Amino acid sequence: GKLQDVVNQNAQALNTLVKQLSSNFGAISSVLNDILSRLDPPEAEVQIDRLITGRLQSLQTYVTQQLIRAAEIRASANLAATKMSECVLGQSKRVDFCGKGYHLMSFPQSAPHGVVFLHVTYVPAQEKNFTTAPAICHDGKAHFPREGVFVSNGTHWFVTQRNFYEPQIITTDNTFVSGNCDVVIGIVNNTVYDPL
Amino acid sequence: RLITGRLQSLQTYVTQQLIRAAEIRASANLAATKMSECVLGQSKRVDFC
Amino acid sequence: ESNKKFLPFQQFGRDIADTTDAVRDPQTLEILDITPCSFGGVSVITPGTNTSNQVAVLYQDVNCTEVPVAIHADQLTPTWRVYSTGSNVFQTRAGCLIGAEHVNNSYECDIPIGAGICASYQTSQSIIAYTMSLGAENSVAYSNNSIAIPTNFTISVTTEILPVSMTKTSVDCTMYICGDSTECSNLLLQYGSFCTQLNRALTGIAVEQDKNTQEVFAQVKQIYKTPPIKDFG
Amino acid sequence: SNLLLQYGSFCTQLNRALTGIAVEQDKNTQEVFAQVKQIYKTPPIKDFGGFNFSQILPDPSKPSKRSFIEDLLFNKVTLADAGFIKQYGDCCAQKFNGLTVLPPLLTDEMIAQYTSALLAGTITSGWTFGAGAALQIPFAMQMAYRFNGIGVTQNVLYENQKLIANQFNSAIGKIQDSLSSTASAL
Amino acid sequence: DLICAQKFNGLTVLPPLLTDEMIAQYTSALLAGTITSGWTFGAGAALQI
Amino acid sequence: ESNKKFLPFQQFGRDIADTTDAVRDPQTLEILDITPCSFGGVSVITPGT
Ligand SMILES: *[C@@H]1O[C@H](CO)[C@@H](O[C@@H]2O[C@H](CO)[C@@H](O)[C@H](O)[C@H]2NC(C)=O)[C@H](O)[C@H]1NC(C)=O
Ligand SMILES: *[C@@H]1O[C@H](CO)[C@@H](O[C@@H]2O[C@H](CO)[C@@H](O)[C@H](O)[C@H]2NC(C)=O)[C@H](O)[C@H]1NC(C)=O
Ligand SMILES: *[C@@H]1O[C@H](CO)[C@@H](O[C@@H]2O[C@H](CO)[C@@H](O)[C@H](O)[C@H]2NC(C)=O)[C@H](O)[C@H]1NC(C)=O
Ligand SMILES: *[C@@H]1O[C@H](CO)[C@@H](O[C@@H]2O[C@H](CO)[C@@H](O)[C@H](O)[C@H]2NC(C)=O)[C@H](O)[C@H]1NC(C)=O
Ligand SMILES: *[C@@H]1O[C@H](CO)[C@@H](O[C@@H]2O[C@H](CO)[C@@H](O)[C@H](O)[C@H]2NC(C)=O)[C@H](O)[C@H]1NC(C)=O
Ligand SMILES: *[C@@H]1O[C@H](CO)[C@@H](O)[C@H](O)[C@H]1NC(C)=O
Ligand SMILES: *[C@@H]1O[C@H](CO)[C@@H](O)[C@H](O)[C@H]1NC(C)=O
Ligand SMILES: *[C@@H]1O[C@H](CO)[C@@H](O)[C@H](O)[C@H]1NC(C)=O
Ligand SMILES: *[C@@H]1O[C@H](CO)[C@@H](O)[C@H](O)[C@H]1NC(C)=O
Ligand SMILES: *[C@@H]1O[C@H](CO)[C@@H](O)[C@H](O)[C@H]1NC(C)=O
Ligand SMILES: *[C@@H]1O[C@H](CO)[C@@H](O)[C@H](O)[C@H]1NC(C)=O
């Protein structure tokens, strides 16, 4: 639809330019060959000067509205040259720039006077409720996860990544230690296993 | 004399509106990028949000 | 009848843009108001002639009891007189809509009317008018120790269309204004250089249309081929 | 009106231009505000870790379901009757010379319902509602992953949580005073 | 014997510089780089993976 | 010489811009075309002078 509306606006403007050649603008005719075959040179000038003035007006209005319309195809072609660099030749972190979801890759296809981009994205499906906690107190020390969240299936405590449920055992090689236990609002007693 | 004088004042008014409307269009495309990248996400672009 | 009090030597009043909007009658020396007789536009709502042929008509800013007399409904065709009076009369902020059925549902917008009202062709089949809906309600189960984690995913592929160039035209300025006549083209020389100015503007548009395509598509300068054995996992 | 017929179609062409401008003003609003297809509501509990969002969330004690800050903005943009939109636009009684004002498609209370669904989805979900389905997370745990995205470790949030929530609350309080003084930024 | 540059009162249409077959060769070289080499071809020489 | 298919009640033919493109001889009753003669559509390729 966005490509067809450009062809429709560029054709209404050229049909208005042809149709305005059949207006007389105050003269005795719209045909220039009938003014010239009916009037002597002094009288003819006053009639051809009305056609010249009115037809110069029609060309001037066409050209002005083509300059405004060409300035927004240039804005739209600069956006498409940015999406070719950042969505096709790279992987983008800007939200909703290349599609809907988390961007993986894009594929460029050619259309008439245009371009079509096929955005491949990642969408997260069915979810589940869990219980969570900001930190875990073990030996008078708080432990925070290195990359993930602390979840609980009801009895045990795991650590998982944020975009896929894949729970694991809380060891000292996926957490880190800082500070005391009385400073974190919501800390939870559990054990931190030691792999060595 | 009055018809061509009044057609010219309408023609001037409409051309100024087509140039102002092209500037609100550029400012509403910036506001739609700041809604997707600053409100619906967290941005790394310096001085954007 | 008005509320303004003139000074006793003033004959009529004006407003900021200098239009007459109050007058004094020269026999009983009272002040009257002037208000224009009502006008507006007539818009026709159709579902497309590949589908049906029944339409609805919107009359802008009328109050809708003035519709049969604002148009000349006694002087119109009997197939035009159906759309001035009926059971399907609805008064909105955008004007008054005649020929559509005011349901109480809410759907997505199909043909916009204004101030929150849309119109579509579903229901046999008829033309309806409804307040548009923004989307389904929802509520997130927030609490201070609850999280939701996804357990699966979905690979999605969407599509985005962008215009890049447009049609390159050119006008021969002398042949449009007066083709082949040589006593006209001697009169066109008295208007200065308007034909070199128009050709110069239209040429710069056409050259830009080719620069628009170089910057989108011609970003790499090696022409890679794809291998014949397509083992892409 | 019969001498005007000699100038061809200069007036179906001027009305065609002002209608493309008017159709485009409605596409501008749906581009900005209509970016979610679910209308989220915020829960009646307000345990947001100590962060106080009462001035930007809507209150039901008004017919216009706008926030407190959204109402200082609406009583600040005005007109000194300097032209013609005050003579026709905001209502009508018609004006002379064939000049009208058309109403927008989304009303002012439809736009405020859109910006309360973006606020309720940020506070309760984080960024997940803009990429799929909204998955809830506590607000202090959400703020620790935004510290982690600027290069500060997440124990700096939890150890300074009461101080961080106090600096935020006093900074929303100064937005009002910069919008209650008459020296308007609008 | 149709010369119809002079048949529409001066109005013509100029042809584009890149044909529709040259544009389709550009978009297949962009795919033949993404699929075989990732994002490395947009920052240097293409390295397969 | 034209091969337009007139009817026996015609003196000339027209097009969209209301210009005469075909006419009939008032003696031999023969339909012939009219087409202009300038050919202004001429471009000049050059290096510098
Ligand atoms: C929570 O997860 C733990 C860890 O897997 C579950 O404990 C195991 O449950 C299975 C049941 O199929 C037993 O065979 C294992 O021996 C259990 N292991 C331990 C260490 O307890 C536990 O059942 C889960 N709880 C709930 C409510 O789902
Ligand atoms: C989590 O574990 C800690 C340490 O085992 C508990 O802290 C102790 O609680 C008992 C009973 O309240 C006190 O007598 C001790 O003095 C506490 N120790 C310290 C170092 O403060 C803590 O209560 C546990 N949390 C819960 C909810 O049971
Ligand atoms: C113009 O003449 C008419 C006709 O007499 C005046 O109208 C009368 O004015 C008197 C006031 O002296 C009223 O009591 C009458 O009711 C009016 N009507 C008639 C029918 O007598 C009118 O006042 C004059 N206007 C002027 C002098 O400005
Ligand atoms: C994740 O979703 C996919 C589909 O989106 C699931 O695969 C389906 O599995 C069921 C039962 O095994 C089949 O009936 C469907 O035909 C499968 N779909 C496809 C496309 O093959 C998959 O099982 C889901 N993952 C989990 C863990 O349930
Ligand atoms: C959130 O901040 C607002 C700031 O306006 C607090 O509202 C004020 O609360 C104080 C204490 O009762 C009153 O003296 C003010 O009159 C209140 N102002 C308004 C406009 O209501 C509000 O209490 C804070 N919320 C919480 C939970 O602390
Ligand atoms: C999580 O819990 C809430 C209420 O406890 C419930 O409405 C919601 O559906 C649950 N989530 C899932 C994925 O079942
Ligand atoms: C709609 O238009 C298409 C376009 O050719 C035509 O083929 C078809 O018969 C039309 N009617 C329908 C789909 O009812
Ligand atoms: C529209 O009609 C109602 C019906 O009485 C009337 O009360 C109202 O004033 C009218 N509105 C106008 C004329 O603007
Ligand atoms: C729509 O709802 C209003 C609300 O009171 C009611 O008055 C009206 O009758 C309803 N319209 C119908 C049932 O067509
Ligand atoms: C979390 O919410 C529960 C339920 O309202 C409340 O009892 C508990 O005190 C809250 N946690 C903290 C740390 O305040
Ligand atoms: C007119 O005269 C010529 C004589 O050369 C003749 O050929 C032609 O048929 C005549 N046309 C008529 C009588 O309509």
Coordinates of N, CA and C in Angstrom, one line a residue, chain F residues 3-44:
Chain F
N3 N -5.2 6.1 -40.0 CA -6.2 5.0 -40.1 C -7.1 5.0 -38.9
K4 N -7.5 6.1 -38.4 CA -8.6 6.2 -37.4 C -9.9 5.9 -38.1
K5 N -10.8 5.3 -37.3 CA -12.1 4.8 -37.7 C -13.1 5.8 -37.3
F6 N -13.3 6.8 -38.1 CA -14.3 7.8 -37.8 C -15.7 7.3 -38.1
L7 N -16.7 8.2 -38.1 CA -18.0 8.0 -38.5 C -18.3 9.0 -39.6
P8 N -19.4 8.9 -40.4 CA -19.6 9.9 -41.4 C -20.1 11.3 -41.0
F9 N -20.1 11.6 -39.7 CA -20.4 12.9 -39.1 C -19.2 13.3 -38.2
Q10 N -18.1 13.7 -38.9 CA -17.0 14.2 -38.1 C -16.2 15.1 -39.0
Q11 N -15.6 16.2 -38.5 CA -14.7 17.0 -39.2 C -13.3 16.9 -38.6
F12 N -13.1 16.6 -37.3 CA -11.8 16.5 -36.7 C -11.9 15.6 -35.4
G13 N -10.8 15.3 -34.9 CA -10.7 14.5 -33.7 C -9.8 15.2 -32.7
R14 N -10.0 14.8 -31.4 CA -9.4 15.5 -30.3 C -8.8 14.4 -29.3
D15 N -8.2 14.9 -28.3 CA -7.6 14.1 -27.2 C -7.9 14.7 -25.9
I16 N -7.2 14.3 -24.8 CA -7.5 14.7 -23.5 C -7.3 16.2 -23.2
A17 N -6.3 16.7 -23.8 CA -6.0 18.2 -23.6 C -6.7 19.1 -24.6
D18 N -7.7 18.6 -25.3 CA -8.6 19.3 -26.2 C -7.8 20.0 -27.3
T19 N -6.9 19.2 -27.9 CA -6.2 19.6 -29.1 C -6.5 18.7 -30.3
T20 N -6.5 19.3 -31.5 CA -6.9 18.6 -32.7 C -5.7 17.8 -33.1
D21 N -5.9 16.4 -33.2 CA -4.8 15.6 -33.7 C -5.1 14.9 -35.0
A22 N -6.4 14.9 -35.5 CA -6.7 14.4 -36.8 C -7.8 15.3 -37.4
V23 N -7.8 15.4 -38.7 CA -8.7 16.2 -39.4 C -9.1 15.5 -40.7
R24 N -10.1 16.0 -41.4 CA -10.6 15.5 -42.6 C -10.5 16.5 -43.7
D25 N -10.0 16.2 -44.9 CA -9.9 17.1 -46.0 C -11.4 17.4 -46.5
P26 N -11.7 18.6 -46.7 CA -13.1 18.9 -47.1 C -13.4 18.6 -48.6
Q27 N -12.4 18.1 -49.3 CA -12.6 17.7 -50.7 C -12.5 16.2 -50.9
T28 N -11.4 15.6 -50.6 CA -11.2 14.2 -50.9 C -11.8 13.3 -49.8
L29 N -12.2 13.9 -48.7 CA -12.8 13.2 -47.6 C -11.9 12.1 -47.0
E30 N -10.7 12.5 -46.7 CA -9.6 11.5 -46.2 C -9.2 11.9 -44.8
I31 N -9.1 10.9 -44.0 CA -8.7 11.2 -42.6 C -7.2 11.1 -42.5
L32 N -6.6 12.3 -42.1 CA -5.1 12.3 -41.9 C -4.8 12.9 -40.5
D33 N -3.7 12.4 -40.0 CA -3.2 12.8 -38.6 C -2.5 14.1 -38.6
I34 N -2.5 14.7 -37.4 CA -1.6 15.9 -37.2 C -0.7 15.6 -36.0
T35 N 0.6 15.9 -36.2 CA 1.6 15.7 -35.2 C 2.5 16.9 -35.3
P36 N 3.0 17.4 -34.1 CA 3.8 18.6 -34.2 C 5.2 18.3 -34.7
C37 N 5.9 19.4 -34.9 CA 7.3 19.3 -35.4 C 8.2 20.3 -34.7
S38 N 8.8 19.9 -33.5 CA 10.0 20.5 -33.0 C 11.1 19.5 -32.8
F39 N 10.7 18.5 -32.0 CA 11.7 17.6 -31.3 C 12.7 18.3 -30.5
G40 N 12.3 18.8 -29.4 CA 13.1 19.4 -28.4 C 13.9 18.5 -27.5
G41 N 13.5 17.2 -27.4 CA 14.2 16.3 -26.5 C 15.5 15.8 -26.9
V42 N 16.6 16.7 -26.8 CA 17.9 16.4 -27.3 C 18.9 16.7 -26.2
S43 N 19.8 15.7 -25.9 CA 20.8 15.8 -24.9 C 22.2 15.7 -25.5
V44 N 23.1 16.5 -24.9 CA 24.4 16.6 -25.4 C 25.4 16.1 -24.4

